[PDB]
Amino acid sequence: IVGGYTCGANTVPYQVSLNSGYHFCGGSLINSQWVVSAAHCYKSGIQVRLGEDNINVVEGNEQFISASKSIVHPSYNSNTLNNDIMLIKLKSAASLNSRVASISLPTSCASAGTQCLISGWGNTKSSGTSYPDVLKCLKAPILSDSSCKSAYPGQITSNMFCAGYLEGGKDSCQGDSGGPVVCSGKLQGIVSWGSGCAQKNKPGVYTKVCNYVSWIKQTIASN
Ligand SMILES: COc1ccc2c(CCN)c[nH]c2c1
Numbered sequence: 001i002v003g004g005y006t007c008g009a010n011t012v013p014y015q016v017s018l019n020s021g022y023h024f025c026g027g028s029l030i031n032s033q034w035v036v037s038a039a040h041c042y043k044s045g046i047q048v049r050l051g052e053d054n055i056n057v058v059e060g061n062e063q064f065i066s067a068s069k070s071i072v073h074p075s076y077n078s079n080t081l082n083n084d085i086m087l088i089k090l091k092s093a094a095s096l097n098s099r100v101a102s103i104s105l106p107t108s109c110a111s112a113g114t115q116c117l118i119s120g121w122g123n124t125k126s127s128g129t130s131y132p133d134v135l136k137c138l139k140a141p142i143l144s145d146s147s148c149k150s151a152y153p154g155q156i157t158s159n160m161f162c163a164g165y166l167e168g169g170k171d172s173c174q175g176d177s178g179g180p181v182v183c184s185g186k187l188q189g190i191v192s193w194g195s196g197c198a199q200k201n202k203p204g205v206y207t208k209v210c211n212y213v214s215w216i217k218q219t220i221a222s223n
């Protein structure tokens with residue numbers, strides 16, 4: 001997160017870290033046994049880390065649970081990033097409490113101008129590299145589809161939206177991939193892609209979760 005703020009320990013209790021020996025992506029807990037992330041975060045040997053604030057210090061609220069199955073969306077296209085969404089099933093159910101909580105799926109799509117919360121442990125610099133050890137937060141509005149398509153001509157599908165600031169300076173970044181975009185208490189986006197971080201006229205692009213609710217619900221009822 002570039003230009004954000006320190007969230008505060010366990011104030012984003014649905015945020016997860018995906019760990020393969022080191023943090024490599026974020027995700028969101030949607031119930032006691034399932035995590036949503038980006039399909040471009042797929043890999044084998046994933047351990048899901050819940051209840052994290054400092055990812056380098058055991059602070060006492062964490063739960064570490066291995067993944068038992070990963071399901072990339074059937075129409076994911078890694079070249080265009082269309083359908084950049086994946087489900088991860090935990091080997092055992094998480095224990096839900098004040099520090100580890102699920103986020104609800106949306107019933108309708110969020111509208112332009114709505115302010116949302118994006119979080120993650122990714123790079124905090126738009127030029128150079130500095131990686132924080134504590135969770136960072138950013139408030140950003142959903143941008144109109146016409147501004148989004150003008151920023152990324154020929155590249156925005158119906159399954160994407162832009163959020164952020166056309167002036168730059170505030171954005172998600174490398175290492176925030178797969179993390180949540182939450183608006184009005186619902187999961188509306190997944191950190192997906194962009195042209196760099198926090199550059200002028202190049203806002204972040206996010207997977208439009210409201211288009212996937214039926215697939216999510218059907219998949220978790222049968223696996
Ligand atoms: C390798 O550099 C990057 C830079 C930025 C991003 C993002 C979000 C950009 N808003 C997702 N993956 C990335 C990879």
Ligand SMILES: [Ca+2]
Nearest residue numbers: 054057058059
């Ligand atoms: Ca920790």
